[PDB]
Write a protein that binds this ligand. Sequence first.
Ligand code: HPA
Ligand code: HPA
Lengths: 338, 338
Amino acid sequence: TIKDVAKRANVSTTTVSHVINKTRFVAEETRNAVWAAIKELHYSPSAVARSLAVNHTKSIGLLATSSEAAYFAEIIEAVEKNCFQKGYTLILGNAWNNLEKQRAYLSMMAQKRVDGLLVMCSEYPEPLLAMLEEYRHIPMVVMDWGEAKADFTDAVIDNAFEGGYMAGRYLIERGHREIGVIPGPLERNTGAGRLAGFMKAMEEAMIKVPESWIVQGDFEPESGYRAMQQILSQPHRPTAVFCGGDIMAMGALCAADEMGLRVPQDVSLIGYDNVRNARYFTPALTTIHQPKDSLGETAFNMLLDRIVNKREEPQSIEVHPRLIERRSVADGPFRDYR
Amino acid sequence: TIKDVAKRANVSTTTVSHVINKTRFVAEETRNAVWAAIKELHYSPSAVARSLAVNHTKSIGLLATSSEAAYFAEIIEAVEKNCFQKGYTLILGNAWNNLEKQRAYLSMMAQKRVDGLLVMCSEYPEPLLAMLEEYRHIPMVVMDWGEAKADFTDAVIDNAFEGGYMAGRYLIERGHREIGVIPGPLERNTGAGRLAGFMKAMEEAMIKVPESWIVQGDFEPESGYRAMQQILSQPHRPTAVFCGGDIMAMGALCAADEMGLRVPQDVSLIGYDNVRNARYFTPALTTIHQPKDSLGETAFNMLLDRIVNKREEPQSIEVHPRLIERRSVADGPFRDYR
DNA sequence: TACGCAAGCGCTTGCGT
DNA sequence: TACGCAAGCGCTTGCGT
Ligand code: HPA
Ligand code: HPA
């Protein structure tokens, strides 16, 4: 079809080409002619042809996990802005933590020859680490590890451990000593590491968490529901709960309310994520803020670099969590004695 | 690179090709040879080359609005499943209700030669309807209109008006006569139409809604916050509120709580959407359920059809809302008198 | 000066043998 | 029988004039 433009304008296609991409000087007339032709013909230059020729698709892949989740959703939306802004195209792919699905999306991706690859898999068993190596050739950044688990990718690191510690401290310093925790999947950073951060804070305080006070969640409101229930559903119960993520949190609020418990009056709750509508939780959720966007943009950026400046060496940038005081926490019995 | 495989296997590329796509019979040996070559060479056939040749990208575009929003997010996630399932690739593009952005994404999309186009723009001013026509050649379905506003696209229709009516009725039948409403943007279906559905129900009941009782929202929790406040922040206030979408709803719950108001005890609330975690609202939100997934799959499906069976004629499928009884509504003063 | 030639990018597929 | 030839898909770009 570029032939078709060239001839309407009676110029070579080389010409048409150049004008379209201001790639060498063209006579005004000539230029106009082409534009006109382009217009009447209603010409959409083909990207695929172009890709075939220039060797890059100007599009990037996001091998995700799930996208509905607030947390995720929020990240992703960020990414897209960045893509758009630098003219990249976004291929969103959710593997649902499934190998097959993941091998599958991964192949489609290489085949479609994505310029780079954003990876948010949540859990990385060897089998998955393996597959990923098989594609080291295609540039990529993992956005969800706590530390660099490979030398063949960039990594943006969140400091989940230090956010967890921040969480516990706060409780401690607000008068708390009988706390419980609903962590996310241990096979994840946002799971394991947050918990650990939290645990250290406790040990330093000589606080011991009774196993009946620790209930695993899967980041879903239902899981928060069950844990909260199980925790309060017992003889002796904590006076404060540390909840792995804001959504499960939201789930935990629900159940407390259902047992007619008062937050923060009967139980204090501290979350983790600072999702877009945590403030609109009831009560307004006090939580730990994860810098989602910076998380997004920052990843994009490494990729671009690697992509453009043809970097070869793995890199890793850390980002920082921070406490957001809302209204789900109250003073504990030990506050005055400090 | 397919040349490279062909020669390692000492066969023509035509061969290599055929075996790769089981497109004509190949000798086992031959077949194996190729596979081997494919393997050592670590061969990823190129999709772009293939696309160039076969004339279809096997990938689809989603010109969206925003993706963080629960409502949206939920739809989209559905779409992706469908894409994956039939081997399509998903290009997610959010125009943020901005023309430029929209013209922009739209062009990138045609250029990248997407097989079909899923459109969720929210608001469709003529200027936008126009641009869309300019691409009638590329098959597409609008998933967010109340009625068919064009003859050059498929449409999946939601019955927002009948869901709105369902909303009002319920209130009416639960003893209510003093109601307020926080609708979404009138420039939208989910905005205008829901409201109207709701309004009809009232008129039939000889219920009049005092303008100070109607506050516009923008589907965001903050907007729900302000409206609820404004509504209760007045001399005379309703005993029940109809809220345009579950999120603004969640915002309205917050403010009631903040004014120390009791839901449903002091004010009843009925929402609209039945978002994934509405049940986890506090209280568990009573709302109108929109069949998001069917909404998703159903759209995909029309597209495919048009794409494969080369349909030409516009089509339109309706889908149906439905009431979900949770715990944010209470009997009104008139219940016993019916 | 301002522009055209023709080869290449990596596949697919209708004729043949 | 089981396979190869060569033209085409729609752009880009190094040499020339
Ligand atoms: O894996 C996760 N899923 C959902 N929300 C989350 N917030 C932190 N990590 C996660
Ligand atoms: O436009 C919308 N935005 C967000 N949520 C919604 N729920 C219905 N319509 C909408």
